[PDB]
Amino acid sequence: LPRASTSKEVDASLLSVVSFPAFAVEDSQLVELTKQEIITKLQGRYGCCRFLRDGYKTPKEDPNRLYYEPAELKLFENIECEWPLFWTYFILDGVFSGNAEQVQEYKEALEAVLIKGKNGVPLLPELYSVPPDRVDEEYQNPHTVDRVPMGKLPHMWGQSLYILGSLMAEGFLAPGEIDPLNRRFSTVPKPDVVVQVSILAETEEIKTILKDKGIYVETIAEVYPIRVQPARILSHIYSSLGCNN
Amino acid sequence: YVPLKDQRNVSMRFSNQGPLENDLVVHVALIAESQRLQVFLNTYGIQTQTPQQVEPIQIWPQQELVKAYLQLGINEKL
């Protein structure tokens, strides 16, 4: 859980796993730990980055070329552009369970980075790029130089998630309606379970031996309504589900 | 007045299954009262739901409908 993969120290995409879509996580202490870590390491000025040392949409790299040469010494350090998707994730994550002040903070943070287009409607830019000239200053003063919008911005994913979050926060719709399966209670502890074990003897000799020491069991006979067989037969039975000719 | 062949899907007089038939299926809903009772029933395999999990729906006693019906049919002039 703490690390996305063996080669990546942290990825921002772990937020989606541990937020509104597909709650699959336990031990909420780890949830708080990963949230604090992503906040303290990937937070920027007008957005957050996916992961350290990505060169996508950079004034270097010769973009018309793929298959990066192994020369990423400093050409992709502290110039990672931005990604407001993980910012608009936070507002939904906060408004989901019980958090309200963080929702207001993130809303006021994201309202500063919006761009108004035709007809005066909200629009979410994809990323903000560092100017090609002011590059040396950022190496000494990270997260200080202003950036410029660049790339496509008909971002339907981010706009849809943001408008869904706004509709959720407006109070028109309840959190229990989006998920009728009730996936919000994955953090509720389960106390314990009681295991039942049955003992049977193969032959009459074994039953006699067990009864000699005071243990009462029954053989495979006398329980004719029920039957026992190995699990390989069960797997061979399972090998016929969903078969179409 | 309807003929004997038409009495199939009339309202408040005959059922959809025909006059000389009675095979109605009725629906039941299981709702518990307290968390302790529902977990105790679940320990024996009994499935029941606490009243706090049906938030969009509401369960009210019979006097609410009585007072609502009493509210209706009021005129001031007469």
UniProtKB/Swiss-Prot annotation, chain A:
Signal peptide: none annotated. Muscle specific. Isoform 1 is predominant in vastus lateralis muscle. Isoform 2 predominates slightly in heart, and it predominates clearly in the other tissues tested. GO terms for biological process: generation of precursor metabolites and energy; glycogen metabolic process; positive regulation of glycogen catabolic process. Although the final Cys may be farnesylated, the terminal tripeptide is probably not removed, and the C-terminus is not methylated. GO terms for cellular component: cytosol; plasma membrane. The keyword Membrane applies. Its main location: membrane. The keyword Cell division does not apply. Keywords: Calmodulin-binding, Carbohydrate metabolism, Cell membrane, Disease variant, Glycogen metabolism, Glycogen storage disease, Lipoprotein, Membrane, Muscle protein, Phosphoprotein, Prenylation. Phosphorylase b kinase catalyzes the phosphorylation of serine in certain substrates, including troponin I. The alpha chain may bind calmodulin. Belongs to the phosphorylase b kinase regulatory chain family. It is linked to Glycogen storage disease 9D: A metabolic disorder characterized by slowly progressive, predominantly distal muscle weakness and atrophy. Clinical features include exercise intolerance with early fatigability, pain, cramps and occasionally myoglobinuria. This is Phosphorylase b kinase regulatory subunit alpha, skeletal muscle isoform. It comes from Homo sapiens. The gene is PHKA1.
Curated annotation (Swiss-Prot), chain B:
Although the final Cys may be farnesylated, the terminal tripeptide is probably not removed, and the C-terminus is not methylated. It is found in: Cell membrane. It comes from the Eukaryota. It is linked to Glycogen storage disease 9B: A metabolic disorder characterized by hepatomegaly, only slightly elevated transaminases and plasma lipids, clinical improvement with increasing age, and remarkably no clinical muscle involvement. Biochemical observations suggest that this mild phenotype is caused by an incomplete holoenzyme that lacks the beta subunit, but that may possess residual activity. Belongs to the phosphorylase b kinase regulatory chain family. Hexadecamer of 4 heterotetramers, each composed of alpha, beta, gamma, and delta subunits. Alpha (PHKA1 or PHKA2) and beta (PHKB) are regulatory subunits, gamma (PHKG1 or PHKG2) is the catalytic subunit, and delta is calmodulin. Phosphorylase b kinase catalyzes the phosphorylation of serine in certain substrates, including troponin I. The beta chain acts as a regulatory unit and modulates the activity of the holoenzyme in response to phosphorylation. This is Phosphorylase b kinase regulatory subunit beta. It comes from Homo sapiens (Human). The chain holds residues 470 to 547 of 1093 of the full protein.
